[PDB]
Amino acid sequence: ERKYLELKSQKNLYLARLKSAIAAQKIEEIAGNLDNASASSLFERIETKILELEAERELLNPPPSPLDKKFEQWEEQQAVEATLAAMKARRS
Amino acid sequence: QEAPEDLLERLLGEMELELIELRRALAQTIATFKSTERQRDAQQLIAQRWYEKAQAALDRGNEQLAREALGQRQSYQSHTEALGKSLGEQRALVEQVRGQLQKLERKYLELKSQKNLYLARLKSAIAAQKIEEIAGNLDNASASSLFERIETK
Amino acid sequence: ILELEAERELLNPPPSPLDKKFEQWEEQQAVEATLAAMKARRS
Amino acid sequence: AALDRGNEQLAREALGQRQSYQSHTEALGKSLGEQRALVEQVRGQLQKL
Amino acid sequence: AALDRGNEQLAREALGQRQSYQSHTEALGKSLGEQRALVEQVRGQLQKL
Structure with a gap:
């Protein structure tokens, strides 16, 4: 009876750690879905979808070229500086 | 198939069920451990009584009885020593697992x-792809289905 | 009963004995420091 | 009234007991100061609103 | 309050424990800064849209 008890x-000692092992193998399992290797079924997939929709607007509404934007910014900055120079010169 | 987005809320919601279940399972472990510790305390306490009984046996010149009392105690010594080994061994397993759960819940939260961060930007992306879509109907290339068509009419 | 005791142990983990000992030690040192100040001031 | 007359021992317990109230007093003081910011800002808004 | 009075040993544990929060604080700070770029850009678009 001493042996039986x-x-x-x-x-009971192994049952608790067993179920802890059951939990251990069943908790990071879905965390396993998140993969640093970009192999995630959904997390990586969902980000790719977001990028896909971004391209949809890129083709639908192509942005102005950086040169025109740079020239736009440059001329605007030159225009801003030109306007700024005019104000100070007039208001000097 | 069901939308993966709906699963995100459910999947973490279902994780809580196991997280609490793990919490419940862990609690059962310690209660039994303390019960074992209390049992160990009782056995050594009982073993001490034999020494106390043996302490009153050697006196008055009757050393013979003290031999039996101490010999009987050795039976408890084996139980006490054997149980002590089990108690020390189980300490390593309980300590390591407890820290993991704190880390795991921190990861879960x-x-x-x-x-939530991706859900908001996701739905922003859903909005982003669903707002200029009809603005896409208006086409600078004169390919608009209605706006260009209506002007031609 | 022990099981429910563990439920509060995980739910409301107690401070570590070192911080409690340091808390008690510093409090005792603070108490002794305060006690020394009172007697020194009130000497 | 405990330290006087040479019985400094009792004063130790009386002051040690006070430290229990000091924790409550200090803890409550922190709560009182924190709540001041929230009450002050909201009151001005209602006048504006 | 640990290093003072010559008991530098306790201060070691207190500061060592803080390093655990430093990792959390530093790690969280990186997340907070990263998310700033995404929130800022989207807000302006809605006003334009």
Whole structure:
């Protein structure tokens, strides 16, 4: 009987750690879906979808070329500086 | 198939069920451990009584009885020593697992925090692809289905 | 009963004995420091 | 009234007991100061609103 | 309050424990800064849209 109760005592010890192992293998499993290797079924897939929709607007509404934007910014800055120079010169 | 987005809320929601279940399972472990510790305390306490009984046996010149009392105690010594080994061994397993759960829940809440971050930007992307879509009907290339068509009419 | 005790242990983990010992030690040092100040001031 | 007359021992317990109230007093003081910011800002808004 | 009075040993543990929060603080700070770029750009678009 001393062995039986001791065996029963051990039985519970492994059951708890067993279910901890059951939890251990069943908790990071879905965290496994998130993959640093970009192999995630959904997390990586969902980001790719976001980029896909971004391209949809890129083709639908192509942005102005950087040169015209740079020239736009440059001329605007030159125009801003030209206007700024005019104000200070007039208001000097 | 069901939308993965709906699963995100459910998947973490279902994680809580196991997270609490793990919490419940862990609690059962410690209670039994303390019960074992209390049992160990009782056995050594009982073993001490034999020494106390043996302490009153050697006196008055009757050393013979003290031999039996101490010999009987050795039976508890084996139980006490044997149980002590079990108690020390189980300490390593309980200590390591407890820290993991604190880390795991921290990851879970952090994962849930990220889950919301992408959901908002996701729906922003859903809006982003669903707002200029009809503005896409208006085409500078004169390919508009209605706006260009209506002007031609 | 022990099981429910563990429920509060995980739910409301107690401060570590070192911080409690340091808390008690510093509090005792603070108490002794305050006690020394009172007697020195009130000497 | 405990330290006087040479019985400094009792004063230790009386002051040690006070430290229990000091924690409550100090803890409550932190709560009181924190709530001041929220009450002050909201009151001005209602006048504006 | 640990290093003072010559008990530098306790200060080591207190500061060592803080490093655990430093990792959380530093790690969280990186996340906070990264998310700033995404929130800022989207807000302007809605006003334009």
